[model samples]
Target: MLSQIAICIWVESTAILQDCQRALSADRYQLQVCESGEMLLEYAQTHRDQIDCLILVAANPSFRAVVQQLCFEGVVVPAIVVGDRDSEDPDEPAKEQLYHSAELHLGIHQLEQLPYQVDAALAEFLRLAPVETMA
Candidate 1:
């Protein structure tokens, strides 16, 4: 059985975001939603002790900035940036390579694969958590 994973989802209110939430919920994952980057950061700070992973939306115009700010603030929580586009775009992969901060980059069209990504990221987070220790 999968343990209930505490996850913060930072994404704009959209169908793709809704689907993501539904998918996670169906698997009984504990979720907290933040519609904006500012809200995400604030929630992350307030609930830092409880949050295990962050599922962020790469489609957000402020996505890169938010990730950078999180890094700058020393928030090393494992993050999975989900892109909504159907195909791998020019900038997404490049940005992922440039940042190298996000643990996983998933596209929304392949939403079914999120469970696997979450498990992988969660495992990695646990492996790395003892060293960095978020919050």
Candidate 2:
């Protein structure tokens, strides 16, 4: 496991952000919480090379724009995008399936198990985007 992991969380809800932070805090992971997708996009643009991985909990124009821009720029960093729940209604299986399928197509690895997935992301980033540190 890596000593540190930097994640920029993109979401719209303050409640969700707090919950995510609380959950991640359990593992002592280094997390940068961004309330808006625009902030996330800006951060990703400036720190694309520094970021280990991106975890998109919900979709927004900022997220779409950033992904499109990155794709055009050929940045092959791994990403995980969690599906969104439109409502508490459970009968919307089709919508959920569509979201999941789209996420998969966009090369977003699902994060059903956040902690485990986060650890795996760290390992994957190291292997895929190896770095050299001077201390």
Candidate 3:
């Protein structure tokens, strides 16, 4: 609904970034593309207040380090982590559930439904780190 909904993307596939760019109109949203998770993390640090959500369409850092560093630094932001497979091996429900509050994993194909998830991701983040503070 805002005029400027800034979304940061750290992805490998060029088409993934292009598709997301087309899905989210420039009128109401803006996109920031990061070449690596390191750049993305750095951007998040300096532009934390401007970031609405982080779209992670690549798995460059073992995926674990990115999330682990985020927690350690207390850089609170919601992330959409897309993977090639949906945990093919059986019984890894807990792994998915573990990062629920800060991150959400999706099958690569599910990226089409991204536009609708921004609100949900931000809501979950705010729930964990309430923002309201009256003087």
Candidate 4:
């Protein structure tokens, strides 16, 4: 069996979080939800080996800053920033900035294709590890 990937999500927006949750299923994803970015950074640092990717569905630009801090601190977990793409207000990072930092920058309109994009990210950075044999 294909190994379930570990994806950590820290999105403050409840509605956006719902869409993100819907995109990833339990069958092939192990989703870890966090309360805040401050806490998430520490957790991701200590558990770097355990986490495959971190998806920040940011409603505020500051939420996107967490990944910056991670990069600064030298945390190596891959990141995806779901910003306010095609929206009037500058809620999150822009396409250029998002692409520059995060693994993938997804617009809100592209939520339905999240799983596919996730596959793309994993393919680019990580191997789809096989299921663990019994200890």
Candidate 5:
């Protein structure tokens, strides 16, 4: 069994961050919160091996760029994007283009659904991990 899963959350909103912390406190995950995309990228580069999955809230262009960069660098972890879908805004169409980049896109109101999402993401990532070969 795994010791503990490491979850990196990138969210600029303090309220949402706190809520995530509270909601996940009962789980056996090592949570790290980043207030910006750049900060999250830095954390990913520095602790790539420790991370299991990423949780992105209100992801922006910068966040997508960082995810792309991370994948390019071979630190490919599954990501869960959480945000409200804006159907009326002019940018909705453009925003949706980037939304599909995430493994799972959920609405902000679906915060309570994180545990299941994280569990599934972690399982998928673990299954995709390279097999250990004996020398």
Candidate 6:
């Protein structure tokens, strides 16, 4: 069996969350779902060591706060933002939000595309992440 990866998912609507989860399950990954941004951040901080990736599904205004806080709290885990690709301009805010934190992927992609993107992110993480031989 493949290792179960840790992913923190945030979604506004339960239905949408379910959709994303279904898509992600195709990759055979273990995901911890967060209905709100606060829950996701809190969980991420506590499980930082075990986490391999972060996927942000912004649903409302609080989404910005979550992103800012994650960056402020020194969470260096790889993060990806899934939302309306044609929506807002996250360049400036995300520029700071992702500063010295981790690589940020932003775009409005279908919930069904999550598994592929996640796989790519995991591959990149393995390539760049340092091996902890002593751990």
The candidate that wins on lDDT is: 1
Model 3 segments more than 4 A misplaced: 84-100, 130-135
Q: TM-scores, in order shown?
A: 0.75, 0.58, 0.75, 0.73, 0.74, 0.70
Error of 2 at 5 (Å): 0.7
Candidate 1 local lDDT, 19-94, one digit each (tens): 7666666456787888788887887776665666778877777677776666556666666767644445766453
What tens digits encode model 6's per-residue C-alpha lDDT throughout 47-84? Answer: 86666667775446767667667656655455556654
For candidate 4, lDDT tens digit of each residue in 37-134?
77778877887667766677656656647766665566645556676466556673255343223366677767755677677766644542331111
Candidate order by lDDT, highest to lowest?
A: 1, 5, 4, 3, 6, 2
- Every candidate's lDDT: 0.66, 0.52, 0.63, 0.64, 0.65, 0.62
Model 4: ten consecutive residues of lowest lDDT: 126-135
lDDT value, residue 21 of candidate 6: 72
Residue pairs in candidate 3 whose N, alpha carbon or C atoms collide under 3 angstroms: none
Better of 1 and 2 by TM-score: 1
Report the lDDT of model 1 for residue 1: 36
Which of 2 and 5 is the better model by TM-score? 5
| Candidate 3 structure, TM-score to reference | 0.75
Q: For candidate 3, write residues 1-135 as lDDT tens digits.
A: 466778887776688777665555547667888766677778878777678877875455444566555455555566666764655576543354323365655566666655666666777677867421110
- Give the per-residue lDDT of model 5 (tens digit) for 7-100: 7888888878776665556458788998777888789897777776677765465666666656655565656667757587776553523322
